[PDB]
Write an enzyme that holds these catalytic residues in place. Structure first.
Site, PDB file in Angstrom:
ATOM      1  N   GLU A   6       0.446  -1.255  -0.198  1.00  0.00           N
ATOM      2  CA  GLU A   6      -0.207  -0.039   0.323  1.00  0.00           C
ATOM      3  C   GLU A   6       0.800   1.014   0.052  1.00  0.00           C
ATOM      4  OE1 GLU A   6      -2.885   0.585  -0.864  1.00  0.00           O
ATOM      5  OE2 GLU A   6      -4.230  -1.829   0.039  1.00  0.00           O
TER       6      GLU A   6
ATOM      7  N   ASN B 225      -7.460   8.554  -6.359  1.00  0.00           N
ATOM      8  CA  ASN B 225      -8.403   7.220  -7.013  1.00  0.00           C
ATOM      9  C   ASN B 225      -8.810   7.179  -7.787  1.00  0.00           C
ATOM     10  OD1 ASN B 225      -8.808   5.843  -3.164  1.00  0.00           O
ATOM     11  ND2 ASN B 225      -7.409   4.883  -4.709  1.00  0.00           N
TER      12      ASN B 225
ATOM     13  N   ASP C 174     -12.001   7.111  -8.506  1.00  0.00           N
ATOM     14  CA  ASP C 174     -13.153   7.545  -8.170  1.00  0.00           C
ATOM     15  C   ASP C 174     -13.445   9.117  -7.382  1.00  0.00           C
ATOM     16  OD1 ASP C 174     -12.514   7.401  -5.290  1.00  0.00           O
ATOM     17  OD2 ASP C 174     -14.336   6.208  -5.038  1.00  0.00           O
TER      18      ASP C 174
ATOM     19  N   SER D  87     -11.534  10.820  -4.868  1.00  0.00           N
ATOM     20  CA  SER D  87     -11.257  10.152  -3.105  1.00  0.00           C
ATOM     21  C   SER D  87      -9.726   9.077  -2.861  1.00  0.00           C
ATOM     22  CB  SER D  87     -12.400   8.642  -2.719  1.00  0.00           C
ATOM     23  OG  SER D  87     -11.773   7.243  -3.236  1.00  0.00           O
TER      24      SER D  87
ATOM     25  N   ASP E  49      -6.653   8.158  -0.949  1.00  0.00           N
ATOM     26  CA  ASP E  49      -5.815   7.779   0.121  1.00  0.00           C
ATOM     27  C   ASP E  49      -4.529   7.524   0.809  1.00  0.00           C
ATOM     28  OD1 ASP E  49      -7.946   4.553  -1.184  1.00  0.00           O
ATOM     29  OD2 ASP E  49      -5.656   4.839  -2.447  1.00  0.00           O
TER      30      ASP E  49
ATOM     31  N   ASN F 134      -8.981   5.598   2.989  1.00  0.00           N
ATOM     32  CA  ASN F 134      -9.969   5.814   1.511  1.00  0.00           C
ATOM     33  C   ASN F 134     -10.496   6.682   2.801  1.00  0.00           C
ATOM     34  OD1 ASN F 134     -12.229   5.295   0.632  1.00  0.00           O
ATOM     35  ND2 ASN F 134     -10.692   5.234  -0.642  1.00  0.00           N
TER      36      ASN F 134
ATOM     37  N   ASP G 156     -15.333  -4.641   9.387  1.00  0.00           N
ATOM     38  CA  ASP G 156     -16.436  -4.549   8.502  1.00  0.00           C
ATOM     39  C   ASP G 156     -17.340  -5.260   7.531  1.00  0.00           C
ATOM     40  OD1 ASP G 156     -18.006  -2.696   8.329  1.00  0.00           O
ATOM     41  OD2 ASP G 156     -16.331  -2.201   6.339  1.00  0.00           O
TER      42      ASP G 156
END
Length: 129
Positions: free
Chosen positions: A35, A46, A48, A50, A52, A59, A101
């Site tokens: 990562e 990202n 989208d 977003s 990180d 995120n 989660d």
């Protein structure tokens, strides 16, 4: 801060990640390497839109607020900048929320694609823990 492999292992261990939800420490280290390459200051946008943030590339769509991710949530109730600190306390507490989660460490795409199924214990070889 750019952590050493065993330095991050120890910090992740002290903070409770080892076997947290049955993920051994090498999983958490392996994910960190792939990562962020262990760099707390790591940021990646990202597709989208977003971003990180930090040691485990948390995120801004779901976990932290960066002030620019429309219709995001902020389930760890923090500014995403908190996550770039050399103190990983927030990254680690938030990651515990993420792993709990329902999808486990599969929330981490690098873990899914680069660590899962491999001998992740190699990532803590040589470390005094």
């Amino acid at each position: 801060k750019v952590f050493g492999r065993c330095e991050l292992a120890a910090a992740m261990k002290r903070h409770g990640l080892d076997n947290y939800r049955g993920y051994s420490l090498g999983n958490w280290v392996c994910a960190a390497k792939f990562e962020s390459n262990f760099n707390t200051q790591a940021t990646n946008r990202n597709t989208d839109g977003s971003t990180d943030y930090g040691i485990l590339q948390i995120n801004s769509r779901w976990w932290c607020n960066d002030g620019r991710t429309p219709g995001s949530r902020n389930l760890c109730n923090i500014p995403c900048s908190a996550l770039l600190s050399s103190d990983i306390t927030a990254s680690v507490n938030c990651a515990k929320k993420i792993v709990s989660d329902g999808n486990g460490m599969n929330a981490w795409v690098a873990w899914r694609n680069r660590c899962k199924g491999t001998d992740v214990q190699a990532w803590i070889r040589g470390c005094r823990l």
